[PDB]
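Bench log, entry 3. Co-assembly request; chain sequences pasted below exactly as received.
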Amino acid sequence: MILIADSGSTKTHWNVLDQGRVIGEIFTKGMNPFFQTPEEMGREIERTLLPQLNSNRFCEVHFFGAGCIPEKVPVVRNVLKGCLDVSSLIEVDTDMLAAAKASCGRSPGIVCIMGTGSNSCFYDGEKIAANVSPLGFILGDEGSGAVLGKLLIGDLLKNQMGEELKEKFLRQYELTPANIIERVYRQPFPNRFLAGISPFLAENIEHPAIHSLVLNAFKSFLTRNVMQFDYTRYKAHFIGSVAYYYKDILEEAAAATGIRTGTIVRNPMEGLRTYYSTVAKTV
Amino acid sequence: MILIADSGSTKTHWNVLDQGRVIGEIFTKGMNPFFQTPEEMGREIERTLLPQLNSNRFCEVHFFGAGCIPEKVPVVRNVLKGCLDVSSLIEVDTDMLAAAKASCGRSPGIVCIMGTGSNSCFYDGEKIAANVSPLGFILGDEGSGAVLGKLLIGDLLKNQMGEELKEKFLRQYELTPANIIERVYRQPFPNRFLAGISPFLAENIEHPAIHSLVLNAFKSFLTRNVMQFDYTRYKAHFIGSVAYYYKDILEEAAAATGIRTGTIVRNPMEGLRTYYST
Ligand SMILES: Nc1ncnc2c1ncn2[C@@H]1O[C@H](COP(=O)(O)OP(=O)(O)CP(=O)(O)O)[C@@H](O)[C@H]1O
Ligand SMILES: Nc1ncnc2c1ncn2[C@@H]1O[C@H](COP(=O)(O)OP(=O)(O)CP(=O)(O)O)[C@@H](O)[C@H]1O
Ligand SMILES: [Mg+2]
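Structure output for the full assembly:
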């Protein structure tokens, strides 16, 4: 009856709300209109989503994703209307707004995403009222998986972390220094590659130098992004796998910088379902 | 007459030496064999160097450049041989070895380059004996023009430096944030773009936040790169426009970190002239 989606770098999460039930665990590839053509997006829904659905008939669709800024929402709406039989309404907005709806519902707060990339905004309870452009894995995106990966690879290859952790990393991911350079400078989606090797931090978090890398990265995200908003007045909510799997260090960073922490959740899907059952039910 | 050259990402510096005199000072574009075919290098030499010479006869050529690793030495040497009339010797090596010969001559030393990129090595008096791979403008290249540019843009756009400096930057270079994202992530030579806007720091160095940016970047270069070497035994030499035009801050970084600076020079040409005169 209702279809909801949150689209990230790696995957899109789809949920169906129908007759008081939730059907989750429906995944496709990411669906970012800055990186995919309308025919690529259409091909992807047709081939990978529709087979997982009993029907393509829906009352409403609420699609959220990276790249679904104003300029791109008509494109995405178009793709969806061509694949799905939607009787009422198709909403398209950003992953950030999904994170806000999930974590804050209908009330105000500071909302942050910490996954492959990172992002932060002020949500007024209805819409994003302010935001800090992340700037990508090179210039910004502090605390993201990609930046964590960027920091780690720099530390290991420059021998900042000793021989053992370096060789353990290269052996684990079957990388040479030459391969890493190739992938970072000369292949598509280097941010994805870097994020993909960042779990090495969580696995080795016991090492003081690893713990420190993560702590400093997070402090950097908070001071450069979150502290731009009225943080002494509003809780900051965090959504994403980086936020979640390094939750202890994120709280440590917040205590050290002076930020009131709120929700820390792995993904916004549970919160979005709450949104569409409770608050958004009425409209 | 002998011809000496030091080639980086921006320029190739050439000197003609004859009878104890420097007979010409000539610039062409950079010639990196990883970024140019042998053909393209030949054309650039013929079109831009040769018109600036009054003969193409040299006893020796000594060409130093980024990318001129052993793998590429035959390719570069062949282009030079096909463009010039050299009687005795064509030597081809790295910009790093040029910095070493210039700053150290025949004595050991720690040698660093701080230009568009950065690099650090130990020179044993004859050849480079050890080095720290720079890792490029994303992963490494601490203290480089590219990285200074990267730090600046982040700081300005994320409002860490005030509104005035941000507006001044965007106005000066006729840039929007959209343009910047485009140039950094989706256009060729993003490191060159970043390095190309880095002079804004030198132009605004009296601003505390600007000075702070540069000091911290230099500290990071020293701790991550130079300190890998036997720096209490050898003084560290610095070659490059970034090392030169931020000399005072580099010395401050060095004193803060316990590194003993030697030579700080804009480029190795002076030193290379001394080298070939002994
Ligand atoms: N168990 C785990 N331990 C450590 N890191 C993990 C992890 N599971 C995932 N990650 C890391 O989290 C990052 C991606 O998390 P997430 O799935 O939230 O990103 P995403 O790309 O879908 C959101 P966006 O694109 O909006 O930033 C990657 O860096 C990944 O390696
Ligand atoms: N007067 C000046 N003040 C500050 N920065 C300067 C400068 N002149 C050049 N730069 C910057 O220095 C960087 C390059 O340094 P340099 O001039 O040594 O060239 P390079 O590193 O490409 C070696 P080569 O000269 O052989 O090409 C660029 O970011 C450039 O804009
Ligand atoms: Mg120059």
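Chain B has 13 helices and ten strands. Residues 2-99+270-276 of chain B form a domain with the Nucleotidyltransferase; domain 5 fold (CATH 3.30.420.40).
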